[PDB]
Motif scaffolding. Sequence first.
Motif, PDB file in Angstrom:
ATOM      1  N   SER A  30      18.450   6.332   9.072  1.00 45.82           N
ATOM      2  CA  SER A  30      17.600   4.829   9.079  1.00 45.82           C
ATOM      3  C   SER A  30      16.802   4.488   6.652  1.00 45.82           C
ATOM      4  O   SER A  30      16.451   5.318   6.679  1.00 45.82           O
ATOM      5  CB  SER A  30      16.658   4.340   9.612  1.00 45.82           C
ATOM      6  N   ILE A  31      17.087   3.426   6.951  1.00 42.45           N
ATOM      7  CA  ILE A  31      16.054   2.864   5.700  1.00 42.45           C
ATOM      8  C   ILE A  31      14.973   1.769   6.249  1.00 42.45           C
ATOM      9  O   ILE A  31      14.911   0.764   7.104  1.00 42.45           O
ATOM     10  CB  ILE A  31      17.392   1.777   5.341  1.00 42.45           C
ATOM     11  N   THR A  32      14.136   2.469   5.072  1.00 44.40           N
ATOM     12  CA  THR A  32      12.727   1.705   5.027  1.00 44.40           C
ATOM     13  C   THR A  32      12.497   1.065   4.101  1.00 44.40           C
ATOM     14  O   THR A  32      12.150   2.471   3.066  1.00 44.40           O
ATOM     15  CB  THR A  32      11.486   2.803   5.698  1.00 44.40           C
ATOM     16  N   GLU A  33      11.843   0.067   4.003  1.00 37.34           N
ATOM     17  CA  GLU A  33      11.745  -0.776   3.040  1.00 37.34           C
ATOM     18  C   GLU A  33      10.098  -1.155   3.042  1.00 37.34           C
ATOM     19  O   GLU A  33       9.467  -2.120   3.708  1.00 37.34           O
ATOM     20  CB  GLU A  33      12.447  -2.136   2.781  1.00 37.34           C
ATOM     21  N   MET A  34       8.749  -0.532   2.642  1.00 37.91           N
ATOM     22  CA  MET A  34       7.373  -1.246   2.377  1.00 37.91           C
ATOM     23  C   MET A  34       7.513  -1.792   1.313  1.00 37.91           C
ATOM     24  O   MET A  34       7.712  -0.866   0.086  1.00 37.91           O
ATOM     25  CB  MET A  34       6.749   0.565   2.212  1.00 37.91           C
ATOM     26  N   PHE A  35       6.934  -3.214   1.281  1.00 39.32           N
ATOM     27  CA  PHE A  35       6.245  -4.460   0.790  1.00 39.32           C
ATOM     28  C   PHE A  35       5.312  -4.656   0.645  1.00 39.32           C
ATOM     29  O   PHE A  35       4.552  -4.763   1.688  1.00 39.32           O
ATOM     30  CB  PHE A  35       7.484  -5.052   0.384  1.00 39.32           C
ATOM     31  N   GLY A  36       4.677  -5.038  -0.414  1.00 41.84           N
ATOM     32  CA  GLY A  36       3.221  -5.448  -0.086  1.00 41.84           C
ATOM     33  C   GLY A  36       2.958  -5.937  -1.714  1.00 41.84           C
ATOM     34  O   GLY A  36       3.934  -5.936  -3.074  1.00 41.84           O
ATOM     35  N   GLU A  37       1.586  -6.617  -2.114  1.00 41.53           N
ATOM     36  CA  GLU A  37       1.005  -6.555  -3.168  1.00 41.53           C
ATOM     37  C   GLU A  37       0.384  -4.978  -4.141  1.00 41.53           C
ATOM     38  O   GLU A  37       1.020  -3.974  -3.561  1.00 41.53           O
ATOM     39  CB  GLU A  37      -0.586  -7.382  -3.688  1.00 41.53           C
ATOM     40  N   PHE A  38      -0.134  -5.089  -5.264  1.00 37.75           N
ATOM     41  CA  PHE A  38      -0.019  -4.113  -6.095  1.00 37.75           C
ATOM     42  C   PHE A  38      -1.519  -3.370  -5.512  1.00 37.75           C
ATOM     43  O   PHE A  38      -1.928  -3.765  -4.350  1.00 37.75           O
ATOM     44  CB  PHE A  38      -0.887  -4.438  -7.112  1.00 37.75           C
ATOM     45  N   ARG A  39      -1.794  -2.127  -5.143  1.00 33.77           N
ATOM     46  CA  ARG A  39      -2.293  -0.926  -4.049  1.00 33.77           C
ATOM     47  C   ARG A  39      -2.416  -0.867  -3.082  1.00 33.77           C
ATOM     48  O   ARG A  39      -3.659  -1.540  -2.527  1.00 33.77           O
ATOM     49  CB  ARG A  39      -3.833  -1.249  -4.818  1.00 33.77           C
ATOM     50  N   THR A  40      -1.789  -1.279  -2.794  1.00 34.26           N
ATOM     51  CA  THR A  40      -0.976  -1.013  -1.433  1.00 34.26           C
ATOM     52  C   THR A  40      -1.226  -0.050  -0.391  1.00 34.26           C
ATOM     53  O   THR A  40       0.016   0.548   0.320  1.00 34.26           O
ATOM     54  CB  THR A  40      -0.564  -1.663  -0.709  1.00 34.26           C
ATOM     55  N   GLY A  41      -0.381   1.116  -1.407  1.00 36.70           N
ATOM     56  CA  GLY A  41      -0.326   2.279  -0.797  1.00 36.70           C
ATOM     57  C   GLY A  41       0.794   2.961  -0.243  1.00 36.70           C
ATOM     58  O   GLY A  41       1.568   3.789   0.090  1.00 36.70           O
ATOM     59  N   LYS A  42       1.994   2.274  -1.625  1.00 36.61           N
ATOM     60  CA  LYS A  42       3.294   2.330  -1.294  1.00 36.61           C
ATOM     61  C   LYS A  42       3.661   4.234  -2.116  1.00 36.61           C
ATOM     62  O   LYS A  42       4.313   4.799  -0.048  1.00 36.61           O
ATOM     63  CB  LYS A  42       4.413   1.711  -2.462  1.00 36.61           C
TER      64      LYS A  42
END
Lengths: 306, 307, 302
Positions: free
Chosen positions: B100-112
């Motif tokens: 499966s495909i997990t896409e993690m998004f957020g602002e800068f410095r979010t632990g990606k």
Amino acid sequence: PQPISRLEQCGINANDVKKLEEAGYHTVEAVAYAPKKELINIKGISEAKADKILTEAAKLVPMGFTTATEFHQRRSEIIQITTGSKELDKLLQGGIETGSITEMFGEFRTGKTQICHTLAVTCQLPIDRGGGEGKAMYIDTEGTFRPERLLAVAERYGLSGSDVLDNVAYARGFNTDHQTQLLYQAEDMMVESRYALLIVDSATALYRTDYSGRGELSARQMHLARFLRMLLRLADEFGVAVVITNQVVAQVPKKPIGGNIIAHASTTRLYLRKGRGETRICKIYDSPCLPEAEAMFAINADGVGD
Amino acid sequence: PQPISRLEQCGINANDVKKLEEAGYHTVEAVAYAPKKELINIKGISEAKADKILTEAAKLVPMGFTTATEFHQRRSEIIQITTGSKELDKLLQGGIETGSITEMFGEFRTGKTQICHTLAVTCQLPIDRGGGEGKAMYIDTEGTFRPERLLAVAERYGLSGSDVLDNVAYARGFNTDHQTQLLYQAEDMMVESRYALLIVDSATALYRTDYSGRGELSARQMHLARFLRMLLRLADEFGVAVVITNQVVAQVDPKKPIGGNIIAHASTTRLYLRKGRGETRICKIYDSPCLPEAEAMFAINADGVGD
Amino acid sequence: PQPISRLEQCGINANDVKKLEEAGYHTVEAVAYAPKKELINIKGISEAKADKILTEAAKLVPMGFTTATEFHQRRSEIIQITTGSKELDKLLQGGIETGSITEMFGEFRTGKTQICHTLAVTCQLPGGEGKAMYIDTEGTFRPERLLAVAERYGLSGSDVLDNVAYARGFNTDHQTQLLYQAEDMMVESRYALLIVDSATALYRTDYSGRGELSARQMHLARFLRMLLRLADEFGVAVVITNQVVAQVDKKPIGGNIIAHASTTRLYLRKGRGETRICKIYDSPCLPEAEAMFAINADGVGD
DNA sequence: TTTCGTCGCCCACGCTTTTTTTTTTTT
Ligand SMILES: Nc1ncnc2c1ncn2[C@@H]1O[C@H](COP(=O)(O)OP(=O)(O)NP(=O)(O)O)[C@@H](O)[C@H]1O
Ligand SMILES: Nc1ncnc2c1ncn2[C@@H]1O[C@H](COP(=O)(O)OP(=O)(O)NP(=O)(O)O)[C@@H](O)[C@H]1O
Ligand SMILES: Nc1ncnc2c1ncn2[C@@H]1O[C@H](COP(=O)(O)OP(=O)(O)NP(=O)(O)O)[C@@H](O)[C@H]1O
Ligand SMILES: [Mg+2]
Ligand SMILES: [Mg+2]
Ligand SMILES: [Mg+2]
């Protein structure tokens, strides 16, 4: 849904019936619905033989102006599978109509797959609870089938966990042509038993990818038209309820990613929108027998509720 | 699972096999996934023998109507690659899932990238951590691939650097087509090996500058959709878990993932990351077909994602 | 830095190379890292030539994947130009990391700008680097600061401090060509680092207006895409600098464009007297903390 | 019983795609 062996006893020999079956006509209705020009391209059937089999098929399948008070009675007897939510089954004036196509489109995280999963369990509910007491075809073209949701819906409805997952038959399409072959196999295997539903999750999502550019637009629309015609033939010849799913595009502010072909072909369309928290909104679209309004449903642990 | 070679065992002459492989079909399953339209597109392969490529390959894969009981039985087989936090584990119900495909998004410095590194470490670890076995595939364009952090994360898990940094790759080309080409090449790389996690951080970061301005948006989105579809094919065919981080845009009408309505559908799981207090972050399940709308606070530490 | 003669001596021997050089994107890494659309509007229209040049000039350091230890060793021998202060020997994990993209903000023309006229201690020390830059958007570069800072250390030379630092830039469309042509002298001689003073400081001086903001943001996205390309291809440490906006809802100019195009951003604040406390922000391998800096007439350090 | 000839006539349209993008201190 008379099997193809019905016309075997009347004139047509076993070899021709086998040729039809390998062609994809597993029922008398599939032969009768097809035009004369289509029973010719398949080798082994002559022109006179094609006219003969067409006549025999028309001898059983009713065609033309016969009676429409009976059809009004049939429409009053439509199954109308229930969504599971008090506002979705009320906005639709009963729920998903059978014998037609109910496309649902939304941006994302709008509950399309959640609604499909709920319906895959609710189609096994008796007519007392709203359903068809049959199996459930699940053509899933994204790898987004989670039986745990079906088990949760079943335990919400007080049905056996094993029964709902035994009834549900699942297949995954990997391309548009394979989607059509899966549809043919579903038509082949829908006569051996009773299927109350047929889900095509993102019926037009691989079209967005397989056909790239403007030069393939005409071919893509032709293939989508053929696929939707096949789906309609399944809807009439079997009485199943086809609930296909559509994506959305932004008018460079939303519009379904299918052109006029899927707009006309889809009997009903639903616009799904994100509300507040777990609750969403559903609006009617292009439904010749339904008004335009909104609804109010939520995505709970037990599928879709309120 | 099985190599492409079996196809020529079925009765197709080796030159057609090499022509199929040149197009990118490094496995029988991969060539079965593509329709006849993508098979006629291969130069030298006409409509002749197309059935011998389609149905002969399809005889080696199910490609049919199973039952939901069998699918649920296969659902236990899934590895369910595990994160580093117990609360995050409860959020995802055991961790990210296989195939499966997990896409993690957020602002800068979010632990990606920290999440990517820790997930790749658990994929390069025995089943005790959560991942069965396999190398870690990195596809870096944003440039945060600093093996200093890889070395730092290697201390907590007690794995020698020889067997982890040599087992992980790198992406040098900062091009939209480069990632697709490198994934097509990783297809043949991984058909000869075993993989568990595949990371493409700049899934949509390239398209922000590669296709600039309204007017070129459509070609950009078809390119992105094609990349996502062949990425889904790679994920399904070899049972690999894919991670694709994303950037954000501020709504000036308030952050939204970029490349919408194309990466929104394709990503089967979405994780929205917010900055909390100090260094702790909050992960909320943006999109999922099974997991609820939960939120999990984790605290990035020296060990890993932490909690 | 790969200015190999292979780029011209390959199968392509025609005016295509000179067209590429004149277009403003030269050296081999301007081909395998460039999309096909850029190879359309350039003079010489041939889509086949695009993939011909790509095939003939994609033979570089491993681009058909690689292993991470091969360049992990390369970045074990990386320069990592140390900061011009001994107070940051714990934080920042050494010095300004080469190959990264560090971002400074919190000030307008003082503060982080002083941090431009300092450092390069590793450049003076052992061989070594001996190289430093300066770019600008709206700045007040003063080489006498570099002279004083070098005189603080053992680098007493004068001419060696010159002929490297650019001091140009007032309007965005003016220094578009400046950052295009940086490579025109960046590849002739090897080079260490690259500060861009007041980079994308206040685009609303010229690229101003509602509806225009989108085009402005596309312009910044293009600029730091080119900046990241130069930093990674030449192996240099780049330092972008912006200014605060005084949120009315302590953030820098740039919104989500430079926010998603940086590596080791770190806020700069004001302490007591000359104390310039230098807090840290997003970073792949740096635990969050706050540093302690100082600026004086001699320079930045102490 | 004998002995072949001699070209003409055009039709008929189908199909939508696709989001981007944050400024800005008062008293
Ligand atoms: N167990 C659960 N309990 C509550 N909500 C849930 C649960 N599982 C999923 N959800 C919700 O359902 C959402 C996803 O709905 P889904 O039906 O997958 O959307 P979709 O429109 O089909 N998206 P896509 O298929 O990516 O185009 C999640 O993001 C949650 O909000
Ligand atoms: N080379 C230098 N050596 C020592 N101090 C300096 C030097 N350059 C600038 N300064 C100091 O920096 C001060 C700048 O004023 P300051 O009080 O920092 O204004 P600010 O509004 O806080 N900064 P900004 O955000 O850039 O407007 C000067 O007045 C000096 O005290
Ligand atoms: N050793 C550490 N200890 C604590 N926190 C850490 C450590 N290493 C990294 N972090 C945190 O993890 C974050 C990860 O950010 P990252 O995933 O690189 O953001 P990004 O969106 O990729 N960056 P940008 O390119 O600027 O948008 C860091 O910014 C820190 O906040
Ligand atoms: Mg949904
Ligand atoms: Mg991050
Ligand atoms: Mg300044």
